[PDB]
Each structure stands twice: as C-alpha cells, then as structure tokens.
Amino acid sequence: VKELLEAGVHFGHERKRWNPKFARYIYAERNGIHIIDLQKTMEELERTFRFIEDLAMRGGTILFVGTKKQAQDIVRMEAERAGMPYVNQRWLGGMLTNFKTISQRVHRLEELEALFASPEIEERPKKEQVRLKHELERLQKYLSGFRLLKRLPDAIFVVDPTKEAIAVREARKLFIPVIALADTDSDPDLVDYIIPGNDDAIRSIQLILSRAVDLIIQARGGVVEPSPSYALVQ
C-alpha cells in the first residue's frame, strides 16, 4: 500500500534553496517550487527498505535522528515502536564519534534510576535533592532514545541530512551507513541509501518512517495497527 499515498501531498517540497546534486531526483519546477519524481522515489525506496530487511532480520541496530519540529515527537514513537534508539532533542557532538565518552553520561544517568527509588529518595542535604533530581532532567531530556545504544549502531536513519549534517559526518567517518529521508537541500552523494521525499511535511515523515519501522517488526513477526502516531493534525 504505497503508490498514491506519498502522492497524497508528500512529493515535491523545497523551492530554489536547492542543491543541484539533486537534479536527478526531480520532475519539474511548477509554480516556482521543486516537485520530486515519485517513480524515482520508489526506485530508491525499495533498495532502501531492502537494505532495512537484510540488516533488520540480521538483528541490527538503526539509530533514528529527527530534530525538526515536524519530526521530533514522531521519532520517539516509531523508534520506540521498534526498540530502536533515537535522537530527538539535540544531536550532541561526538555521539557516534566520542561515543565511549558521551556514553559515560549514560553510565551516570541510570545511577539515578537507582536513587530514584532507594533509601536516597527523601533525604541527603536537600538542596542536593532538587539539583541531583533536576540533573536527571537534562539527562532524560537529551538521552531519551540514546540510553539504549550500548554499542555503535549498524545504521543511522535521518530525516534532514542538511539539518543533521553533523550526525551524518560522524557516521561516514565511522563507515556507518547513512539512511535518510532527504529532499532538495541535502547532498545525496553522502547519503548511502536515499529516500528522496520531504524533510518537512509531518504527514510525509510519518507515512515513510512508520512504514519503515513496519519492516523492522515484519522482519521479526507481529505487525499491528496503523501505529500510535497520527499527530495533532491541523
């Protein structure tokens, strides 16, 4: 069930803010805007999903990254609808790269789940009370989907590679293959498996992402509903 779904309103997006590297994956410039060829979207989408399968079934790990308004919450869903880690709030420099050291923050996060419910729940010099228990805040805020990552991922799934270029560059440095939902800002050449689509339309992001998580579960049996994600659409 694809075909026209994307053609809902999730074809073409950005306008003359382009990157001529994307000249291939475009149909026409109607009414001032760029409109992306969907035949080609599919051509790529298969190969891309086919990648997902082959490493999904092998029991891989995809690191999901979306931070635009229009993604964000739709990432902490489908990622968690998959047990797959995600970055949602802000991409920290060296997440893949300085990983060992960024991890030390998770090493130190879950020292607080301990003292969440412990003899240290309503005691200790109680200015420390809030500050320690408001330190977990920064921690829970940024490392929500990141705590699961215990080893470097086998892939990264991105929704805007020119927004998330800092992550991508980290990937490729580590040869971690880059998967991305990407439109006419983004430089294809450094996106390994490409889903030429729409970095912005909240509909588009979901239509694609959710369905890609579907294969991640289909490759381990037990698919469900249209999935807990239909946004505050209006």
């Binding site: 560059r169 490729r172 440095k173 040869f175 050449d189 450094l190 390994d192």
Partner: protein, 138 residues
Amino acid sequence: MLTDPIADMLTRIRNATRVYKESTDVPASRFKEEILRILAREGFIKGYERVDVDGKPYLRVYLKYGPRRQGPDPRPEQVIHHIRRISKPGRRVYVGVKEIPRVRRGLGIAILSTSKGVLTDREARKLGVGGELICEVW
C-alpha cells in the same frame, strides 16, 4: 579560434571527470577521433560517438569511473587520473622508437602519432616507429 584542439580536448575530458559528469562533447575532428579510440580501446572511456549539436559535428565522450567509495567523501576513483598534453604548438615533441617513454611501469599509456598512424606506445614499439609524442594518460 582555439590554439590546441587536442589539448583542449584532453582538458574538456579532464574537467568533466573531476565533477563526475556522465558525458562531454568536444567539437569534432578526425584526428580527435583517432585519439579517442585509443582511450576507448585501452579502457579509459566507456566510448565516444558522433553527434551534431546546434547543427555542427561534436563527439560525445562517455566517461567512466569507479565504485562509490567507503568513508567520508564517497566520490569514486577516477579511471583517468592524469591526462596531459605533451607536444604543444609552442614546443613540438618527437621521440624516435628508441626514446619512446614507458608511462608508469606500463600501467599508463602514451598516445603518440606516427606515419603508421595514431598509436599507443606499445603498439608503436611493436610496429617499430617513433613520432610526435602527443600526450600521456593513466
């Protein structure tokens, strides 16, 4: 007008490949054709073909690269890493058969024009003839 049609061609090719174009034109001459077939035969270009663009003869040259490479910067390796004119109209160059250079322990090639015709260096060594050392590739 154009001062070195051949040198211009090598360049057009050089320039196209570094941005990884799939194709280039070069206005057409029979001598240009003869050089092209060497590149072609020796595995540097996918091939050329004649076309007439805006009413006048060009040769469409089809370039040829490597596989998308691994890490940061996935740009392919070039098949033609180094194409270079030797005998320019300023300083014309002629080797005899004894002085024909071997480009890069053989992994290269030197297009070289003789009275037996346009040849690689091994072709010309074998045929036993020298001439205008045209350029070199690898």
